[PDB]
Each structure stands twice: as structure tokens, then as C-alpha cells.
Amino acid sequence: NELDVPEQVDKLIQQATSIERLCQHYIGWCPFW
Numbered sequence: 001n002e003l004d005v006p007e008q009v010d011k012l013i014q015q016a017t018s019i020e021r022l023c024q025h026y027i028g029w030c031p032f033w
Contacts, residue, residue, distance in 0.1 A: 023030035 019030065019032050022032045
């Protein structure tokens with residue numbers, strides 16, 4: 001929050017990115033959600 005950079009909006013890409021390849025391997029239910 002201190003600096004004005006989209007560092008937060010990033011974790012979303014990483015989070016949404018992770019699950020895509022992390023949850024597509026197993027069953028729709030994954031400990032990454």
C-alpha cells in the first residue's frame with residue numbers, strides 16, 4: 001500500500017495462474033482454492 005504499484009493486482013495473476021495449472025492436474029477440488 002505504501003508504494004503506488006500494482007503489486008497487489010499481481011498476486012491475483014499468480015493466484016489465478018497457479019490454480020489453472022495446479023488444479024487442472026487433479027480434481028476440480030484442490031488445496032490451492
